């Protein structure tokens, strides 16, 4: 805290409580006692615990029939109204679409739909599988996830 | 009907003005105006002006008659004080308060 190291008043004789600094955290405009610093909040996950959670998550989606498997999911033009009409036919509104390799048409058609995220098989994470109401996997993404999960 | 007049930020302590205001509480206005004339207090000059002011409001704004009006309510509130410095012996300094008041007078024929 900006200031001086001067003692505000003499140690004895003034009838006031002892002070040694105006930067004391007891004083108004003084320092914080245990002031923060920037810190790193990241934890470690063992590889086997990370992969084990995906298998528990993945098998729960099947058990709760929140997982849907196709081999056909693409759009002919990068148009948001095309993907939105496709999803209307399938009765999906909040959905995570996982594809073998991500197409540019499907990536661009879904950017403006906030309830829809489209991912490659390499980019699935635990939190997104639990967040979305339904998960749609192409049967070539269903392939690649199982080799990744050993 | 009741009619109000105030003097806000009147320059006098409320304790000094309260002595005068207790003299006319509940009096007829003709009687209270004569009491305030013959009181040798500065606050009696302040209190009388508010009393004359409230009487005029009753006639002009409310169609009241002088002969019926009576001092129904009167009270003095503390106002903000102004803080000043007075220097004392041996380098010490004191804080002087210049106290003010709010004077409110309500007249009514009922």
């Amino acid at each position: 805290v900006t200031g001086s190291g001067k003692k505000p008043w003499r140690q004895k004789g003034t009838g006031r409580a002892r002070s040694g600094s105006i930067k004391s955290p007891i004083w108004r405009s003084g320092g914080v006692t245990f002031a923060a610093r920037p810190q790193d909040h990241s934890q470690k996950v063992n590889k086997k615990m990370y992969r084990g959670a995906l298998k528990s998550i993945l098998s729960e989606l099947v058990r709760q029939d929140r997982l849907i498997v196709v081999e056909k999911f693409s759009v002919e033009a990068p148009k948001t109204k095309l993907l939105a009409q496709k999803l209307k036919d399938m009765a999906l509104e909040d959905v995570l679409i996982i594809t073998g390799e991500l197409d540019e048409n499907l990536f661009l058609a879904a950017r403006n739909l906030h309830k829809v995220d489209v991912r490659d098989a390499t980019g699935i994470d635990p939190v997104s599988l639990i967040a979305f109401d339904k998960v749609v996997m192409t049967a070539d993404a269903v392939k690649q996830v199982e080799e990744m999960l050993a | 009907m009741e009619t109000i007049a105030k003097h806000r930020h009147a320059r006098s302590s409320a304790q000094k003005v309260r002595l005068v205001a207790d003299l006319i509480r509940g009096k007829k206005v003709s009687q209270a105006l004569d009491i305030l004339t013959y009181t040798n207090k500065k606050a009696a000059v302040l209190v009388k002006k508010v009393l004359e002011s409230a009487i005029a409001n009753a006639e002009h704004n409310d169609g009241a008659d002088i002969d019926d009006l009576k001092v129904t309510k009167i009270f003095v509130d503390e106002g903000p004080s102004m803080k000043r410095i007075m220097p004392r012996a041996k380098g010490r300094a004191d804080r002087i308060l210049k106290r003010t008041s709010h004077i409110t007078v309500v007249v009514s024929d009922r």
Binding site: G13 | K90, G91
Partner: peptide, 17 residues
Amino acid sequence: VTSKWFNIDNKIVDHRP
């Protein structure tokens, strides 16, 4: 300010040595 003059004076302060 400084101490009161009677609190500095030895005669007043030092009455029980």
